[model samples]
Target chain A: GMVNPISRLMQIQQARKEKEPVYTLVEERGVARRREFIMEVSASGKSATGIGPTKKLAKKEAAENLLVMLGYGRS
Target chain B: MVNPISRLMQIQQARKEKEPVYTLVEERGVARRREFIMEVSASGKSATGIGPTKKLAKKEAAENLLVMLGYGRS
Candidate 1:
């Protein structure tokens, strides 16, 4: 509909234009300042808690999220 | 307390497992039948409709769902 949902690059460009910081909640350990929040490219989505709201997870951490959200090979 | 996990779904398996059947009721062509029961997988569920609910999707599907759910790769 709207430019086919826009590619990742376009989204990045928009973030830049909108001044989106892409903030990350870094760990106490000094991993990498630039990589405060690692982004994952997944098809599947994560599971939900039996008694609470859902959480936003990382790519590598969310293989299932990657699978479901991204639509794994099997599907 | 440690709550159980619940994974997301695929278009086909969701259809079989009954995910998109509710989201995409249009694809049914006129007269929506009583096929879908309207329910998502319970994760750690291991069985029900399509997907890794059975032996077929046990290893791979469940594994991936766990990763996304942040249980494994922990």
Candidate 2:
């Protein structure tokens, strides 16, 4: 089974004893039920964004992108 | 890279979380710094806890183990 991107990100940072990644909801569009969320990770002056139908999915996407940026495979 | 043990535990629980494994060690020496270290493992992943006392080390190890297991920030 695949791992949760958020948890994987946390594990990496924890092991490194570095600060956890910060996530923000950068944008939201359309109706509530059909909303598209844009989530971004702001860490180490690096930025990665994810767009999805839900905030949770957006956050996951953003985490996955940041993981890749940190040289980790996408979760 | 640390694997996601917490999520794995959850997935296993939902379908089946296997119990975590723990090990403890006590050091003793006249001129050495004696300390207790606790180690915990799950899903083939593991973590170690270090402290001056057994209880403290165990807790620290548990916290780290959870983090590796996928429990973040405490």
Candidate 3:
């Protein structure tokens, strides 16, 4: 089962009446070779970048970190 | 300010309330490139460094992004 970081983030935002979270593709490395993508997702000034082979995976990784910071579940 | 390793400390301070950003480093080839990767916060931004040594690479990565925290980005 997927944890669905984006959806969870949205839920938290709505519940707390916070602004929308922003996701930006800040860095990209090795398109020809390893092909990595780094995306930073931010809300309320806090941000983090997740790394993965694809965009969705990176977002998921970043979401996990966000959850931890906001005192959400682990793993 | 000759120490290239200062970036790591700066990165740490950049975290949310000293929450501790995590970083990962990887060895790319048999001899050439080292990569320094840092995740600034649970949500803010990151930095990258590629150099001959791990410390140099990480410090380079840290220099650019740590300032974001200074500007109240997070």
Candidate 4:
């Protein structure tokens, strides 16, 4: 059976023994300054991007995006 | 071109606007393994590091400290 998006992403990294995921802050929006964090796991060619008040949330969302793209997670 | 020290100084300057409690977690054992863990209350995030010496451990930990504090990530 196929695994969930979170677990699948975890497995993909664990297999490769990759350390912390790489994140890049793309844009800052609004007066409140919400930032967008883009995440990339080299094993997977597709990159993910997320927006949040903090960089961490953005990266989390970006990872979830990849999961959804792989048909494992939701938006 | 910029360095981590300068980057940290910038973050510290921003931190004055908002004060976030920082927690440094350290773990060491007979295996000669030392890990530096840093957490920030502002974002409720944490990071870990490992080095040969305490200073090195702290230096490495400082990198994660920035990441947890919302600096650029590698």
Report the number of the highest-lDDT candidate. 2
For residue B29, what is the lDDT in candidate 2? 31
Between prediction 2 and prediction 4, which has the larger TM-score? 2
Interface root-mean-square deviation, candidate 2? 12.3
TM-score of every candidate? 0.22, 0.47, 0.46, 0.39
Model 3, A1-75: lDDT tens digits are: 235888888788889899988888877776342566788888755787787666776787787787777777765
Which ranges of candidate 1 are over 4 A from the true structure? Answer: A1-16, A26-75, B1-60, B68-70
Cα lDDT tens digits for candidate 4, B1-74: 44443455556666674444445665555575644444344344544555566545545555665655556543
Quality of model 4 by C-alpha lDDT:
0.53
lDDT of 3: 0.61
lDDT of 1 at A13: 40
iRMS per model, in Å, is 10.9, 12.3, 15.2, 7.5
Off by over 4 Å in 2: A31-34, B1-74
* Candidates sorted by lDDT, best first: 2, 3, 4, 1
Worst 10 residues of 1 chain A by lDDT: A44-53
